[PDB]
């Protein structure tokens, strides 16, 4: 029986049992590199969250509730594609792109640290979360590397990198590669999404060695058609719930369900946070690489008779119960 009923218990075998053992520990710090979330929401009341704005950015003009209202109205109407961007352009041309970021940062941050009994109950609500907004080229590898270095200095155990910088290969700028290696050398996990390009292009940092790449799964566990895959996405990535994931949006207590690898990544950041929290609770040392390799090696591969291209599932669907066996002997 689940002591902390979570929306993803039925889609994620072993989640409920893991929540019965922990909701996170404050000694585990997650730094989220994304936009600027809304801490006034009740899902963050009592959450140990704080913002650190990179000092080398000039802060952007605040965004009016009205602009957020406009964005959400166009979403609620279910407009999509060209029609959606013509709508956004007509009412909020100068803030549409920042709102996309900030909105997603709300959703992602709540998926991770949302407090129980609020509108959004996240995976790891008792962990310490530092948002590092990039609201103020901003996805350039230089700037992500700089952000990463700071996240380490801030004491990150996990760095959730919400960003996808395009690439047609596994090569990224060396500065970013060095930043990822630096995370491995310091026992810090980096999670990031594989992207929603349907393999028309790939993403940095997902495809760089060292990162935990995350792909998006449907409700039934099969991979979403748009979720990028192949190369290092497959070798070092894992599939997790990505469709219809519940989360927050700014300025309103009403939550919204979103779809994408950006919504699957946070779930894995959360699951990883709990596995690390459990190490602390049991006096074992915190070990990011053990957690990452445990998740990868126990991931369940898709059935070739159900999914046409199994490599789309990357190493496989997240398998908490296997992870628990490897790390804790359960």
């Amino acid at each position: 029986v689940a002591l902390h009923p979570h929306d993803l218990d039925e889609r994620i075998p072993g989640l409920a049992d893991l929540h019965n053992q922990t909701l996170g520990d404050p000694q585990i710090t997650i730094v989220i590199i994304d936009g600027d979330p809304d801490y006034t929401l009740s899902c963050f009341e009592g959450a140990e969250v704080s913002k650190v704005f990179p000092y080398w950015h000039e802060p952007a003009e605040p965004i009016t509730p009205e602009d957020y209202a406009a964005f959400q109205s166009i979403r609620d109407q279910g407009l999509k594609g060209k029609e959606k961007e013509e709508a956004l352009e007509a009412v909020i041309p100068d803030t549409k792109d920042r709102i996309v970021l900030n909105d997603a940062a709300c959703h992602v941050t709540s998926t991770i640290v949302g407090q129980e009994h609020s509108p959004v109950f996240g995976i790891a609500p008792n962990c310490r979360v530092i948002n590092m907004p990039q609201d103020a080229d901003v996805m350039s590898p230089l700037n992500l590397a700089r952000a990463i270095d700071l996240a380490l200095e801030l004491g990150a155990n996990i760095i959730h990198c919400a960003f996808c910088r395009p690439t047609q290969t596994s090569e990224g700028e060396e500065i970013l590669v060095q930043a990822i290696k630096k995370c491995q050398d310091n026992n810090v996990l980096i999670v990031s999404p594989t992207g929603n390009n349907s393999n028309e292009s790939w993403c940095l940092p997902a495809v760089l060695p060292g990162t935990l790449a995350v792909g998006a799964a449907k409700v039934d566990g099969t991979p979403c058609h748009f979720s990028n895959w192949g190369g290092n996405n497959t070798k070092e990535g894992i599939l997790a719930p990505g469709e219809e994931i519940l989360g927050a949006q700014p300025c309103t207590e009403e939550p919204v369900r979103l779809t994408g690898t950006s919504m699957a990544a946070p779930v894995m950041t959360g699951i990883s946070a709990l596995l690390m929290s459990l190490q602390v609770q049991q006096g074992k040392p915190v070990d990011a690489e053990a957690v990452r390799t445990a998740l990868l090696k126990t991931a369940i591969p898709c059935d070739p008779e159900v999914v046409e291209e199994p490599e789309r599932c990357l190493r496989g669907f997240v398998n908490i119960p296997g992870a628990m066996k490897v790390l804790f002997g359960q």
Binding site: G81, V100, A104, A162, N196, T259, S262
Partner: peptide, 9 residues
């Protein structure tokens, strides 16, 4: 328009 972070469709 790239369908990231949230996919429409």
């Amino acid at each position: 328009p790239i369908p990231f972070p949230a996919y429409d469709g």
